[PDB]
Amino acid sequence: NFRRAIGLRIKETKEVYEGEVTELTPCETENPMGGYGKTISHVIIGLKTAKGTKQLKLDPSIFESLQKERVEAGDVIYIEANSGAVKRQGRCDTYATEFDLEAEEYVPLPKGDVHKKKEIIQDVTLHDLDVANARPQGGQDILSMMGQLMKPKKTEITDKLRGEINKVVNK
Amino acid sequence: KIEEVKSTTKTQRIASHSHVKGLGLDESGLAKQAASGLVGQENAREACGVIVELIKSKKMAGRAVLLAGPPGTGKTALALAIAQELGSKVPFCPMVGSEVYSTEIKKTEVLMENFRRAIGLRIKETKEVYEGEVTELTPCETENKTISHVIIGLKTAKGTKQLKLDPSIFESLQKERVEAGDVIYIEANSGAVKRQGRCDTYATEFDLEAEEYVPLPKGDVHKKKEIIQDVTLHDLDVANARPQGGQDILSMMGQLMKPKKTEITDKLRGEINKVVNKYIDQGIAELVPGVLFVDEVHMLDIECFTYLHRALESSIAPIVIFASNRGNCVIRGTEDITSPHGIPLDLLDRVMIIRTMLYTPQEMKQIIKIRAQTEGINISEEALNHLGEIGTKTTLRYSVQLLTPANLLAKINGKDSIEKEHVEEISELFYDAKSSAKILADQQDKY
Amino acid sequence: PMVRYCSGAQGSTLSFPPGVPAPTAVS
Amino acid sequence: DVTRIERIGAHSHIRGLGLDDALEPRQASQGMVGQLAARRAAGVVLEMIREGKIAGRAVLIAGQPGTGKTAIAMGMAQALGPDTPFTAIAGSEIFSLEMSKTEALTQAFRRSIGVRIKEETEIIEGEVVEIQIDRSKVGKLTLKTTEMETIYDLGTKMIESLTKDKVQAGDVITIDKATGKISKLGRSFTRARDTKFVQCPDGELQKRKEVVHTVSLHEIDVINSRTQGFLALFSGDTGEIKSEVREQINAKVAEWREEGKAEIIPGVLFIDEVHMLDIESFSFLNRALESDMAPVLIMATNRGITRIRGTSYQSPHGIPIDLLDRLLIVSTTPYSEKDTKQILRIRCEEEDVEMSEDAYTVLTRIGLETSLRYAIQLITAASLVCRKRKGTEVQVDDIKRVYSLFLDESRSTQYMKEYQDAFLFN
Amino acid sequence: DVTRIERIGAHSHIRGLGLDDALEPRQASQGMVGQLAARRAAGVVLEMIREGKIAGRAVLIAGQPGTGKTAIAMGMAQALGPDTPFTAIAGSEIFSLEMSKTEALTQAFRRSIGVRIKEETEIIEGEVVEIQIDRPATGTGSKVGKLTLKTTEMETIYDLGTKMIESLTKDKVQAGDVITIDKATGKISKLGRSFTRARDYDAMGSQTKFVQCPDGELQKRKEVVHTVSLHEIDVINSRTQGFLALFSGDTGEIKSEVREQINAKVAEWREEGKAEIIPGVLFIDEVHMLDIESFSFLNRALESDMAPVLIMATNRGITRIRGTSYQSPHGIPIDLLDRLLIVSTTPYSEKDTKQILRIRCEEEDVEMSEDAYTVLTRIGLETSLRYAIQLITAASLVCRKRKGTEVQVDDIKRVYSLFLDESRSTQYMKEYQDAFLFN
Amino acid sequence: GEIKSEVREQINAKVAEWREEGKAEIIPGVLFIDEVHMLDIESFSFLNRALESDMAPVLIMATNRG
Amino acid sequence: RLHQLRSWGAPEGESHQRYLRNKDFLLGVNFPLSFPNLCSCPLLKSLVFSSHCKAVSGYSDQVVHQRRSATSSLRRCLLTELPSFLCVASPRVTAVPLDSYCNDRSAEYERRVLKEGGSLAAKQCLLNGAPELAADWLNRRSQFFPEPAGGLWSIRPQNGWSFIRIPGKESLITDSGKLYALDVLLTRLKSQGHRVLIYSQMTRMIDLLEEYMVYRKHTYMRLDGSSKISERRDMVADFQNRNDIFVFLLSTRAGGLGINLTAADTVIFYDSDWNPTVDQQAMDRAHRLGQT
Amino acid sequence: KNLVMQFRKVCNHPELFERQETWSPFHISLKPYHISKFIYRHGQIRVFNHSRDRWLRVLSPFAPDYIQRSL
Ligand SMILES: Nc1ncnc2c1ncn2[C@@H]1O[C@H](COP(=O)(O)OP(=O)(O)O)[C@@H](O)[C@H]1O
Ligand SMILES: Nc1ncnc2c1ncn2[C@@H]1O[C@H](COP(=O)(O)OP(=O)(O)O)[C@@H](O)[C@H]1O
Ligand SMILES: Nc1ncnc2c1ncn2[C@@H]1O[C@H](COP(=O)(O)OP(=O)(O)O)[C@@H](O)[C@H]1O
The missing domain is CATH 2.40.50.360 (RuvBL1 DNA/RNA binding domain)
Structure with a gap:
């Protein structure tokens, strides 16, 4: 939030x-x-x-x-x-x-x-x-398609990803 | 004519038991006063001398010992000494009693995996x-x-x-x-x-x-x-329970999915036992039973203590070292019932107890000297005597903890070694657990 | 014999050796 | 000597609940002693288990700590032998994170009752003497026993099987005729030159054999759950089997019984440490012990009148009266000096140690001053001290050494109270 | 003018600890003032962290609410620099649904030890003059080709391998593109179109910003320094192609066998000179949130040679340790409190409370009269320091609304009447006792 | 499993657009919770803001408790 | 296809404003960060960087060095791959999948199907991503700009799916103090342009040195006592008369006499004999009247 | 330390004393899980209840008959 x-x-x-x-x-x-x-x-x-x-x-x-x-x-x-x-x-x-x-x-x-x-x-x-970024889309691979047939669930997004997004939006 | 040398890779980090190198017993089974990094605790070191023979005998299963004694007396230092004494090839498995509470698998089964x-x-x-x-x-x-x-x-x-x-x-x-x-x-x-x-x-x-x-x-x-x-x-x-060998699509894709733990069933362990016995019979295999060390045992749940009644009575189970530093506490999970060391009497009857006990001022000075020369620092005799006094006033842990900070002050003001005045300064920057507990009790209106 | 694709300052080019169908039929 | 997985543990010396043919318990046999009343009673229950006619029956073994109430159950599990299901769990083992608490008991019942069948197989077994192939394909082979020979023409699917498994002259092989599986048992001794070696089989090449086979009622249920259900019989992923499947399978096995196609082999559930099931779990066993396909169940406990888990209520054994009326209670009694001495002798024989008659005497007194299990632990330690000393027989001074190194709980408690404020949280 | 993602927040003014070369604290420097005793001690533990020799050292910072416990932790976190890992956690954040408490702490430890890897590779960097791709008329698929690259000083031709051609054709590079090729990796990357040739073109296949041609030597070396925590090395190795779990956070209860294996391999890289291990710090704020199971893990977790330096802060008297009955100092059990050094902090005076406000208005871009500072300093002792700090923006806004250019004392009296302190709020809550819920 | 909040927001925007276009119409219904006295304190505090949207049902609740 | 229609074809109702069209509850395409839009718009594509099949670490600075003038320049935030060598764990044990045996011809037919893979469609679906992609993959040999592969075929772990580990050629350096020393000497001397003789006292070692000279691509030439007399003539005459050959490998007893290697600026002894004079000859067969 | 040429060989390079081998995990297979003909023929509910099961697919609301009539 x-x-x-x-x-x-x-x-x-x-x-x-x-x-x-x-x-x-x-x-x-x-x-x-x-x-x-x-x-x-x-x-x-x-x-x-x-x-x-x-x-x-x-x-x-x-x-x-x-x-x-x-x-x-x-x-x-x-x-x-x-x-x-x-x-x-x-x-x-x-x-x-x-x-x-x-x-x-x-x-x-x-x-x-x-x-x-x-x-x-x-x-x-x-x-x-x-x-x-934490759950990509537009799959043409087993990881994506398996991940998209499976039931989606929220996940504990890491502080590294928050860090990297902050770095690029500043650019 | 000209001479040159090169070596720049940074040496291994020092930590809380890196001075311990073994029990330092003599050949008759008696304990030397100071050897291989340990001092004092003669009855407990002699008792551990029996246990390193009990392991190397290969005769036994499910024998268990409890190291008990007040905080700061050297319980885990002894268990680490035994891990040196057995050598690298015997498996020694360290664990803490709060690790049984997994979110993937039942507590009763985490014990069996270990x-x-x-x-x-x-x-x-x-x-x-x-x-x-x-x-x-x-x-x-x-x-x-x-x-x-x-x-x-x-x-x-x-x-x-x-x-x-x-x-x-x-x-x-x-x-x-x-x-x-x-x-x-x-x-x-x-x-x-x-x-x-x-x-x-x-x-x-x-x-x-x-x-x-x-x-x-x-x-x-x-x-x-x-x-x-x-x-x-x-x-x-x-x-065997989640396979990845072979080259079929199924095993290949089982290498990609998120690796969840699972409750391995008794039928699989049964079949694995039969296979390894047949590898031994053919002379292909050698068995080396080792040691499981369960530190902070006083906070397994009573479900877990009541499981160890069965696991220690197995013909297979390895030799187990428990450790505890508690008085007559309430047993976790019961809310009503208290017992020695925080362990139920029913389990405490299935173990041999090794008593461990408080240090004299001379022993503290000796440990501090050992530890200072392990951390690689030089200390003057009147400074070391002052640390000895601080030990008697507080705890040997705190007395050892002042060493590296004092050495930083010494090098900042250009001295090669700890002088008494360095220790006398560091003692006033950092409080201990008793002196800080005092100021916090006086000002108790404001926290 | 090899079908050959070229890109350069002079613009792009696609090329077929003689006797290969060159299957770009018009519509 | 070489080491089994099964080294010496706490009940290893018990090799049977030993009795005479009238179920009289003799004073010491098959590694166990004393407990006359309890071992006779255990013998009567072992006869009920073996006869098998009656379902849904339970017995509680109860008494002070260290009175052989696991020992008699461990001895009974030896005496019943293999080929009659016996399943043992601690009461704390049903509290799964992956599966309901009432499912784990439901499943534990069904591991312990077996369906038995017998079936017949056409099998080839012999030494191969020649094998020939061509450029479909047709080939030929010759087989030998000690007693006869044959040549066979091979059809296509056998040519695939034999060419796949690289069979060579002089190999000894077995063939499941109906399926095309080859098993190889090594090579004949007479062609061990130019790998494991064996003599060629006796009798005829093609034997109609008959094989008796048995599966736990649980193992039927799991195979039916999924595309390859049998893997969950190892991996443990058998999460909450749907009750309408179990409903179906019971009716199917009931008709297999009546039509005589299979026969049902009852068994035993040894739920140990029962005093720590919840009241929810007791309330399920209350009514699980009423099926035609319930096993016999044996429960051990060492608790006085106590609060039953998940409640404020107090009752004998730490079990509700609601469940105690389903069962009969067999009560163990603590040992005398004679029994204590004799048990120590038996443990000395199992561990391979010898001691002086005075050493047995002082250790017996220790055993009465500190409970048996302490004394039994001194034995191994004493022998290690003797070996360090280059002795042989255990003497009294070697025992008195170990008694000063390793404490019992009563002495350790006394030596804790003199440093009361140095320990945490008392 | 422009607003970036990071703004003015509660501790934005702190930029170090303001110690001199002899490790004595200056009265006011690098945005910290007063508090001489604890700032000295923070200097010593910071010096110990930079040395890196000794594992598992632990420090607890204690004292009243609102006396710079968190400020000193941020102070040293600035001084320690960006290149050395410093991890912050509030004690609440370990109570996961995905993994157990001892796992969460193990991850927080292993996330705070860096492995630093310098890497060099050789790259070709040029403007594409031409591409030839030859394809078989039927055949096996053994495509072959030639490519030419230019700079302002040099140009040359490359005969192209069969593994490499798929990369150019996958990423659809064409003449006029400027590209950088990593020889060792076999990866292409594109900077943009050169300005010149896009004039001589078909109907559009691309519409993007141009870039200038590269200069001098066509082949050049590149260098990158990667810092990778032990934790991300554990995650990468937990399964094949597991990379997304570094962002997703989906990896639960990693196998112990993996970490044991990594701890060995990291040591080998150290001795080989392939990587540098760099100990960092874990800061757990509000540490009194931990259960006694978490404390009991820390006892023995802290004793490994891979442990980072640990810092904790708390504002608690003698209180009952969370998840138990027992009272103790700082609400931490003595088992753990014996294993660390305590630094303690002191309440402020007029002289330094005024100086804190002065250094705060410099950061929020405000001017006030000395009369206004005098009033505000009194408010900041009648009531807590944080409240006085909170009036400064409100005063500036009320000033600006009335077209002023310097905060006056009546602006502060206005704001002080408008937004309450807790003590005044709690007082008014007495006279409406029946109208609020659940008293 | 817990529909993401930005989806329900998007649907509300789209349904509002369709009733302005006249492509659709909204029919309000009812939610009845019998034995409501055993909703929990966190769930009651959610109803305090559920009953405030531009599109919510009427609630009827029944209870037997003193 | 729905995205193009929905995002350009938007104005005015199709019907005097009645009716929903087919597909009108499919709203997910409308989101600004949906894959169609993020493919359509070139710039948002850069803010969703975490693709499912690359080892992306995050953003870092990078530095580049010209060979001329030793001038550097700095590139600000760019995406980075992790280094290749962090992938290093492996199981101690790798069991083959457990399987069932039943003694019936029909049961054996069933299990054979499972070991081959259940059906051509289902197997193609996992292995190549879709049966459409399987059909294309067979003929992608014949297309200049092929589309991506979709199956397990689309994934390539850095080590392959096998766990077997081969000791890499770098292990020559990691395992001996002497080569660790030699490597820094030779890399320095190479950059300085110095020609070198290496002398060594075991044929077994000159083999290890040759494996090193091939790995770090220095150029080299060796003259063991096992070399034929005619080879020595060519090999000496090629170490004079050329700039090319960086280093000569010798054993002192074979090559330390008469040889006139005036082309070498430097001499390295990887080991030494119990007798001097040998080394003196080995040195003075470089250090002599022809040098300046 | 627990001939001169062995020390010299080890000091020159340890590959001269013992060559490093290619490691690979320990590989294992259990015996396959045996199912009897009796259970493979008469024991799967999937097969012996196939006549009953068909009704549950007939009485389905997902039959295209029922969708058209509902819709
Ligand atoms: N007898 C001893 N000789 C040497 N060092 C000791 C000895 N006993 C304890 N120590 C050291 O003193 C500290 C306290 O011992 P520790 O094993 O942590 O006590 P505890 O029993 O509370 O776990 C550790 O640094 C430990 O290595
Ligand atoms: N009659 C006996 N014969 C042999 N061993 C016995 C006998 N009675 C008790 N023991 C010994 O006592 C231990 C088992 O104690 P037991 O009373 O069965 O367990 P629990 O107290 O948990 O019910 C073992 O060491 C076992 O050998
Ligand atoms: N010594 C100091 N020098 C500078 N700023 C300080 C100092 N002490 C506190 N502050 C500031 O005052 C406020 C309160 O301090 P804070 O760190 O939140 O207190 P605590 O964590 O001790 O409860 C913060 O805005 C902080 O930046």
Whole structure:
């Protein structure tokens, strides 16, 4: 409770690209590099929203991710501009009529621009930093997943963690 | 021509019984006046001379002794002397009577863990191992698919061999992320694997790499060797009750989870007893019963005292030393009943008592001199006589406690040694338990 | 024969040797 | 000499509650003496235990400290022998942190009653003489006893088993036919050259054997609790077994009895130091002693009229009258000089020490001035003093040495009162 | 202007003990005043702690409420410096639900002995000019590559190993990044994008603050000093991959066998010169909270060669030792009280009570007239010192509300009428005796 | 096991938002504690602040004691 | 996916303000420190530093030293790993898991399944993290930027899962006063640029010295009496005529005569003979008319 | 102290006198826990009550039948 009654207010930009994908256009150079058959300089992705349409030009390494996610033309997707990762949301609502039944929930077309930016102020107690460090989340490991199937319980947070959090919030 | 010396590692810390080196008896069983760091207490040192024979005889189980006498008389100093006298190889297990109150396991069972810990065992284990640089690695597939074998080629300074191995070992090699050119070790009894690194032969293959490199193993690829293992009965009991040997997913994950204690059941201890008797019969094993020391015994609960009635009557249990410094106190857990030393009469009838008794002024001077030269400080004779007087006015503990503070004052004002005036100053900065109790009784309106 | 990924001052590049599918089909 | 785990302890000399066939207790036998009335009574109870027809019956052994009331129970546990369950616990051992106080008694009852079955097995045992394999696979082997030989063609699952366990010519092996498990017993003496060695078996290679097997009623309950319940039979994690499972298993074992598929072997619960169960625990034994599957239970105690734990009430033995009407009380009596001397002789034989007849005499007097257990402890110490002295027989001066080193409680109490204010908290 | 997480609190003005080189206390220095006797004794035990030779030394600080017991403990805790472990506990804090009392004290001891490890490794630190990763057309997965690194003075090319390439690709380093590579560990770390090349770019995959290119030699050595308590070494070794328990506090009743094993290994590191052991201090405030079971543990726990120096403070007369019937000095049993040295403290005068207030207004940024100090000093003897200290901020605020710039005596008389002392409160509680609950 | 306090606070905020939007409505009910005379002194002191939230039931309690 | 929709797609009701949508009781994503948000926002990611699979100690200062000018610079608070070598405990005993035997063909079929692992799904789930991740892991050989592994495969303790302990090459230094002395001498002399001869009186010891010269990578060359006469010629001619070879290893009776090792600035005797004159020759086969 | 060359060898380096071995924990297995055919066939409640147990899954409120009808 003594650590609940102390707050931080901290502020950061979010930037994201989103829209229905109209095209994936891997673009070749005029000549390959020596000894190679073909070379790709970039991918073009065409995104559309209720406000308009535009091409984004991207690094070739995007293409692997766009087949890990089962992206196909007429899906709506987003890209986190600070990280480069891409995520599928689903087929656009435009196509909801193309069968009598399909086993996917359709999602409405994004509104506003293809590229979005805002500044937000986020506010948290020191107790929230204590707990989020003492029991992490976003598991892809046995320790996390076991820890998340098990019944959660409060624990005697150590004075070392309180120490380290104090050190970094001062920075 | 020129001469030089180097040594800078800081020497071991001094503590409250580090002057004690053994009982200092003579060959006839009588006590010398001053030897191996002890002085005085002749009947109690002679009595401990019988007990070090009782231990080394190996004949007995569940014999128990109580050191009793006023605070500050040297009870735990004697028990520590016995721990020196038996040597390192006999297990000596120290414990305090307030440790039975665990939050994981019942008091009655914590005692049993400590008893089983005070019996040692010595085993001639034979291990057979394969080691080398892995030059080749190939699995062999079979139908309902399965893996039938792995084939491994190994290389050492002597030459090479090729081996056919169980799929359990392949599962282990995969888990350890082993590849060709790695140097590995496998112990075939346990099924365990260890990676060491890549062979030194490859160490220059990259400008920038994360690996450590090791020289090629010497000796034959396959060999067997004897390791003398020291262990306790408790260590066998617990390692079977929550296992981590082998290489299956279950045991491997049981190495990650939070290590809770558990009430080991009588059936497991029963089966472990049969196994170790069969190791003795084959001449693989030697048994070394040791000692359990339970200091501050006067605050086990009456549930615990009434359990020791059964544990001391076992044919297995080791020799036990209890210690106490209490008068006719009330027995913990009863609220109504008082008895000598804080222990029930029913248990006090199952022990032999060793009396320990107060020091004379000459003995205090002698102990203070011993202790000062242990802490490494020089003291003038008139100062030491003054400390002797302070001892008679207070307690030998307080008289010893002034030594190091006085030496700090001495070096601060440039003296090499304690002078009387240093002791005479320190005595006024720090009160004792009686002089502080006086001022606090006079001003009792204000605390 | 090896598929090759490059990043530098001149920008990024992905490259396939001749006869490898180069599986970036358009959509 | 080599050391067992089981070295000499406080009751090691007792090797049976010794009596004649009419249950007359002879004056000294099987390591124990005196206590005529108590040992006869204990013999009658041992006959009830062995006959087994009657459930839910209890006896209280009571009397002063050091009057053989654990001794007769320890002797009775030897005399009953293995292969009839006997379980011993201190009353302080049921106060678990992991499991209820009434669960620990419920479980202690069920460790002490056994279900017994017999079953038959097809077993191969013999020396292997030849073994052959090919590039599915088909192979062949030959086996020998002292009396016959055979060759067998091997099916696929045996080829896997034999190839897994690296069987070689000259090995002596046993095979559980039905399951494919190989047990190896070493190598034949005639191929001990080029490891443990043994002579080849007698009789025929394939024996239909019959095996008698028995499991505690508790051990049925635990196996049924979980995916691999049997581990909790070692690790102790058997937390509060659901009573509707026990309800089921009792009805199942009752039908196994009536259909003759198994038979029930009653047993004994020796709850020692009973005076320190709570009134809650007594109130459970009150009614646990009424099942068809209750064992016989034997309780020891050394307490006069006293306050029963968890209350302000006072009653004999430190046990409520509510429970004392369920049981019969057998009362031990303190020893005379003859008995005391003779018990000291028996302990001297068990510890391997010899002493002079005057040394026995003075030690007997000490034994009457300070209670037996003190005198019995002097024996070992005296022999250690003699060995230090390079003597052999214990003499009176070696006993009088030890009597001055190691105090009894009555002298130690006297030597405490002269320094009364130096001890803490009196 | 800016407010950090640490602020003005009850003992923020203390910065040492103010002793001279001959270990004599100055009248007023390093924010401590008066109390000459106990400050001398604190100097001697502080000197003993710095020497480090002798284990298990214990000291008890005693005296009336509000006479600088805790202040002297904070004083020495400042003087002893940050580099040497000093642990504070209030006596209440050992009554855990997760572990037994003797475990809690064992942890508090082992948390107060430091093992100090200097560590050096070789690092490469540069701006990424290019990356090549080659991947098999089918094959086994034996990827290979080359990377080039630049500084303002030098650049070079590295042929890359197969264990290392997974790290670059995992953390998605690309040209224009500035990175630091630890050769021994095989770990990458990133400083940021260089200012130049981000102009020649695609649609955005990152949007963050830039950093300057590194200078001079491309390879350089780094040094870190780690101080690790014995306690965290016990926790790390209690199970595989147990690291989170250092923050989480989830590790219960550690096996004795683990500590015995660590005590051995620590000694070996000392003799090898691999690590330095550094004894510190455990301060238990309000120590009269402990049960007699806890005291009985301390008796014998204090006798190990790994024990730290122990300091305790208390404000108690002859009182009954918690969890028993017996009365004793300081509410501690004589078994333990015999094993330590007692330092005692003295009530204040006018002369030093005024001087405490003077040094307190310097810390809270307040000006007052000498007349105001005169009145406040009287209040601070009619009533306790802490109350007088508590009026100083209230007086400054009431001054500032009325647009003053120096506290006057009528500000203090105002505040004194508004916020009560205990003695006055307790007096008014007599005249409403029926209206309050459970008298 | 002891729901964290910041969760119940978050839910109250969200339910208040939905009734302002008209997406939801709140139905107050009752809590009846029979034999209330054996609540404990710490539990009574909690009811002193439970009966003060913007969203609490009505309590009915029954007791037989003098 | 819920986080993106909830945090940008927020404005206006879908229905003229009626109805809850599907997923509307899933509130946990809204918290500022939820994993989606803390992934989405680059800066809060730094305030939640305690990840479940690294040995993070806390924050410390760090110092870095250039080789040129010996100039240092100081880095303020950065995250730190614990040192590698604090992981040092091991059980005295390691029992194999207790197992059941029953004499029935069907019972034996059951227990075989348990020892292999109950089903491919359940085993893949623990071992690779999910059956989806198992399916990907098989082909991750063929991807440039693969995603993390999820199973027990994702965890790597510093010593492996085995408890066996091999004496490391540093034990040469820890165990002898003489090598502890030699190491500080050679590290100093290396930094000063001095060339050195080491003489020693046991072939068994020159082997231990060679293991040391390989471990701390000094470069070296040895000439026991067991060396062939032709080797001595090359090996001497390579210690002259080159800057490369830091140290020469010799036994005094083999190499102490005639040899003309004028390239050495320094001489170390790791041990000495009962007879002088030998050492005098061994020294003066460096100290002679060719030196300056 | 309890020939000259032994002292010289130990002083030069202790590995010349006795080489340090690779330690590893003591490894153990008990005999496996024997269960009779009789108990493995007639003794598990999981099996002998399987007909009765099925009713407790039929009368479940978690059957998709009952969820639809309730919902
Ligand atoms: N006979 C003795 N000879 C030497 N030192 C002694 C002797 N008796 C006690 N000491 C020392 O004096 C102190 C008090 O003894 P200790 O064993 O702590 O007494 P206690 O019986 O109260 O536990 C310790 O420092 C101990 O080592
Ligand atoms: N009749 C006897 N025969 C042999 N030993 C006996 C006999 N009576 C008592 N003892 C001895 O007395 C001790 C057991 O005391 P006992 O009366 O059975 O325990 P308790 O007083 O706890 O009930 C042992 O040393 C045992 O050998
Ligand atoms: N000698 C002193 N010099 C400086 N400040 C002091 C001194 N004595 C007490 N104080 C201050 O007065 C207040 C009361 O002292 P405190 O440590 O809380 O007393 P105690 O712990 O003895 O009850 C604190 O704000 C403390 O900083």
